[PDB]
């Protein structure tokens, strides 16, 4: 049908306000929910409907700053929320030592990303601390963990690391050569990229891999033309109407971005079928509450609302800003980020 | 739902 723009604006506004007891499982990643909402409003050019200053303070209260004795550097970055009970402190005083308080790579990523979207200049971000924290998360094989205490490691976090380094315009946060090696090793026999070596290639990991390389500005250098052609073939084969994440799996709205954005970075999204993709995405639109779902006649959520919108953006939907396919922010925001980086170099 | 974390 048609794109219910205002309905989605309200949907995102609601997400920023209060969530029902049944979303408790997102408690530790509330910052990524905020990102979906803010970046989503940004994409719809409606950031005006929120108080950028309040949200900026909230985000800064999530930053894990180094302590007086700088003994917790390997644990700096951003928290997903205040679930640990640390007193509200919008990156003012130093860090109040806590046995289990550390950052989470996906939160440091969405956190910085949110700050940039809200117009903040990142002056209150302890860049060196975050980078030190990032470095500590990388494993021998080049991939990353999410927290210093330990977690699973895969392509998802390689992408987070890349985004962080890119936004802080400093790649000392990772051993790029090893990360690139991990990305190459994840390529499957079917030519898509998997979460790790030997695993089933997947639209999500293929996006994370390709986008990371583009952020590093090494796509061409890492993959040969023949290789890129094979990857392109795998990616464009994901379109059924909407896109699925793996061969023989049902389509899901969010892949219109994961795969679509990858195709965009590979310069062949232009050859996909726009109409069927757009029609599928809209068929998952919740005309009553707003937002999008993974499947039609299914309940909407912040993740699919945001990616469905970004998916539409890839085809320049009337009313939606163009999304930067590798950074996962509006081109406008990526532009402001360029000015920011430039401004720093003085 | 799609749990990515």
């Amino acid at each position: 049908l048609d794109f219910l723009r205002d309905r989605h604006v309200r949907f995102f506004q609601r997400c920023l306000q209060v969530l029902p007891e049944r979303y408790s499982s997102l408690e530790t990643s509330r910052l990524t929910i905020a990102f979906f909402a803010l970046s989503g409003l940004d994409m719809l050019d409606s950031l005006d409907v929120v108080n950028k200053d309040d949200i900026i303070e909230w985000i800064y209260s999530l930053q894990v700053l180094p302590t007086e004795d700088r003994s917790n550097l390997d644990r700096c970055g951003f928290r997903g929320s205040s679930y640990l009970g640390i007193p509200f402190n919008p990156s003012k005083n130093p860090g109040t030592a806590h046995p289990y308080d550390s950052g989470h790579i996906a939160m440091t990523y969405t956190g910085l990303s949110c700050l940039i979207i809200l117009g903040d200049d990142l002056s209150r971000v302890d860049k060196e601390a975050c980078l030190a924290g990032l470095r500590a998360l990388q494993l021998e094989d080049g991939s990353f963990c999410a927290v210093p205490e330990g977690s699973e490691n895969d392509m998802r976090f390689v992408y987070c690391a890349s985004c962080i380094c890119y936004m802080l315009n400093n790649w000392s946060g990772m051993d790029m050569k090893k990360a690139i090696s991990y990305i190459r090793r994840s390529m499957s026999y079917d030519n898509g990229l998997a979460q790790g070596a030997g695993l089933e290639s997947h639209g999500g990991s293929t996006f994370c891999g390709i986008a990371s390389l583009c952020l590093m500005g090494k796509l061409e250098e890492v993959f040969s033309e023949k290789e890129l052609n094979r990857i392109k073939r795998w990616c464009i084969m994901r379109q059924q109407n909407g896109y699925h994440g793996r061969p023989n799996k049902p389509v899901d709205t969010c892949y219109s971005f994961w795969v679509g954005a990858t195709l965009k970075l590979l310069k062949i999204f232009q050859y996909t079928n726009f109409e069927k993709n757009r029609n599928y995405i809209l068929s998952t639109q919740d005309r009553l509450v707003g937002g999008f779902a993974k499947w039609p006649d299914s309940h909407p959520d912040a993740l699919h609302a945001y990616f469905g919108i970004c998916g539409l953006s890839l085809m320049e939907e009337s009313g939606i800003c163009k999304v930067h396919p590798a950074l996962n922010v509006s081109t406008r925001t990526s532009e402001r980020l360029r000015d920011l980086h430039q401004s720093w170099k003085t | 739902k799609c749990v990515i974390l």
């Binding site: 509330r30 699973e152 499957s188 030997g198 232009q270 | -």
Partner: protein
């Protein structure tokens, strides 16, 4: 011990054993963002979890508290980490924890934290004896669960349990020849055992795949496997493959087959073959067949491939 939905459940704020602890509340400051509303019971468990966490109390009561915190939110990675700290400090029976996590995962098979927890346990115990069967059960409710397959590959590689996997793969492919995860497992097993350099193995595999393709010709997974194990050797180096596929075209045609042929023809052009301009024309003919009638949704893609072939071989 005391279940969260038991008639006699008592808030921690009313338990004598917890009187000495001061609960620590969560505070999102003056203007909270994406704030989740919590029931009295929920907030009560976590207000005490924060207290115990903040003091790094390695107690038996804290251990029991994590069980509740986990029931309320199994996705809280910090809770799982602390529980692991406690498992060590209190030297708890890990075989018992295995039963616990086994039940937790069955109820939440798509949670990252629970699979990570089980992996740490198996590493601690250096015992993979229950793994393959447990995973097979999970794969029974969802044969494509990415977490399950990832865990299965880790177990097999870490403890070298390759002996029966190829047979397991054969069984699952019979249940659903379209399961892309199983085809990936097959390649995982083979390339990590015999490898594909043994012409006898390659032949067995190519023949096996063609048999599967004949059963269900429209299966991207089967075709991707076939092309995957041959693309690096050089598709044009197998003259009988080209004609066997051309023979299938009559009845068993599908966009995957046409695409394969196009890829064969391209390899030939890439290797200065004989009748170059003739081969190129055979390819272009197929590219258009795909665009115009066999894989129309990718119409612009196939034509883009065609233009690429012409400007590269003329």
């Amino acid at each position: 011990f005391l279940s969260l939905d038991s008639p006699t459940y008592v808030l921690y704020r009313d338990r004598a054993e917890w009187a000495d602890i001061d609960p620590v509340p969560q505070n999102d400051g003056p203007s909270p963002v994406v704030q989740i509303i919590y029931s009295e019971k929920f907030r009560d468990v976590y207000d005490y979890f924060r207290a115990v966490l903040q003091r790094d109390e390695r107690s038996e009561r804290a251990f029991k508290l994590t069980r509740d915190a986990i029931e309320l939110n199994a996705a809280n990675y910090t809770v799982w980490h602390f529980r692991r700290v406690l498992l060590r400090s209190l030297q708890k029976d890990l075989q018992e924890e295995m039963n616990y996590i086994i039940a937790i995962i069955e109820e939440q098979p798509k949670n990252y934290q629970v699979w990570h927890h089980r992996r740490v346990l198996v590493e601690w115990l250096k015992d993979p004896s229950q793994e393959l069967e447990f995973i097979a059960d999970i794969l029974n409710q969802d044969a494509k669960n990415y977490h399950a397959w990832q865990h299965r590959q880790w177990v097999i590689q870490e403890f070298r349990l390759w002996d029966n996997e190829l047979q397991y793969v054969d069984q699952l492919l019979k249940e659903d020849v379209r399961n892309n995860s199983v085809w990936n497992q097959r390649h995982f097993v083979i390339s990590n055992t015999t490898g594909y350099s043994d012409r006898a193995v390659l032949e067995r595999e190519v023949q096996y795949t063609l048999e599967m393709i004949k059963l269900v010709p429209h299966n991207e997974s089967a075709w991707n496997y076939l092309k995957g194990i041959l693309q690096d050797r050089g598709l044009s180096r197998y003259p009988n493959l080209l004609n066997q596929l051309l023979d299938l075209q009559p009845s068993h045609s599908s966009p995957y087959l046409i695409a394969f042929l196009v890829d064969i023809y391209e390899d030939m052009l890439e290797n200065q073959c004989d009748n170059k301009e003739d081969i190129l024309n055979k390819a272009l003919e197929l590219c258009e067949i795909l665009a115009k009638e066999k894989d129309t949704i990718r119409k612009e893609y196939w034509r883009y491939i065609g233009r690429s072939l012409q400007s590269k071989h003329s």
